[PDB]
């Protein structure tokens, strides 16, 4: 625990409903009161964990807030304040009007019971997402961090349909180390991790890069389940053996080309997120340059 500069008074917080259960916490939608410059009512997302939950988990939580206190990037959901005072601990953050990317993607299938009345994303639209997602993962490795769990569900859509990286439960610090040779005994997303980490537990920039191609696969397949039909033990053997995911039908060719570059069996061959943004800067939204990171001065 331990109160910070981010500390917030619990009284200002009111919880409305349950948005969902994530990698390990609980996410409620609520309204903060006078927390930002201007408005007195700024509905937010509140992630919490049970003070009746495993110490390992509880710690995983402390860590998530910790690494969010930095992270000032357009394409990263903003941490908004903590509430360590008493019970229970409450981490607040900017609510993303359109939920996770996964859920949002599915809601666009022509079929869809919850379809918002618009067509599945145009090719223009996909590039944009891919870019802000990548931009954000770049900002990450920049501040020296591996995300270890990049996937549609952990990407939130803002109101302007902008995409930002969310959920940093597996994110790790990397001067020195610049790994984990893993550790053992823990929940892992096999469908999204690179082959090395699947055997030689590790996780690196090139690793998240692998996870990144799967998000594109997710985007294109409209949130079909990666490696559907297979069991987690089967996929485990497969991607380790030397296999890779397929390719959605009617899938554009520019993207497919990206996916491939993310799937070399050798990590030293995966492009860098920055290198990915570059390949896409000439086809983005005229606004991207200003809120960007690829253009941010910090990109040293």
């Amino acid at each position: 625990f331990v109160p910070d500069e981010w500390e917030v008074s619990r009284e200002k917080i009111t919880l409305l409903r349950e948005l969902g259960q994530g990698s390990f916490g609980m996410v409620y939608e609520g309204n903060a009161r006078d927390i930002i410059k201007g408005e007195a009512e700024t509905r937010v997302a509140v992630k919490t964990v049970n003070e009746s939950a495993s110490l390992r988990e509880r710690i995983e939580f402390l860590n998530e807030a910790s690494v969010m206190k930095g992270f000032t990037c357009h394409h990263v959901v903003r941490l908004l304040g903590v509430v360590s005072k008493g019970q229970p601990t409450l981490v607040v953050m900017e609510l993303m009007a359109h939920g996770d990317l996964k859920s949002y993607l599915r809601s666009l299938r022509p079929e869809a019971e919850n379809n918002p009345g618009r067509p599945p994303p145009t090719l223009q639209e996909m590039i944009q997402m891919a870019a802000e997602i990548a931009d954000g993962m770049a900002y990450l490795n920049a501040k020296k961090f591996v995300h270890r769990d990049l996937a549609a569900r952990n990407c939130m859509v803002a109101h302007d349909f902008t995409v930002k990286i969310g959920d940093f439960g597996m994110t790790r610090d990397i001067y020195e180390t610049d790994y984990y040779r893993k550790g053992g005994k823990g929940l892992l997303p096999v469908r999204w991790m690179a082959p090395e980490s699947l055997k030689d537990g590790v996780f690196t920039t090139s690793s998240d890069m692998w996870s990144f191609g799967v998000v594109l696969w997710e985007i294109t397949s409209l949130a079909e389940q990666p490696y559907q039909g297979l069991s987690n033990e089967q996929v485990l053997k497969f991607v380790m053996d030397g296999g890779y995911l397929d390719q959605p039908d009617n899938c554009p060719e520019r993207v497919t080309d990206l996916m491939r570059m993310c799937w070399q069996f050798n990590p030293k061959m995966r492009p860098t997120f920055l290198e990915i943004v570059n390949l896409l800067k000439d086809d983005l939204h005229p606004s991207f340059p200003e809120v960007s990171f690829f253009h941010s001065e910090e990109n040293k």
Partner: peptide, 6 residues
């Protein structure tokens, strides 16, 4: 889809 393992 976070299967335990090593």
């Amino acid at each position: 889809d976070y299967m335990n393992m090593s």
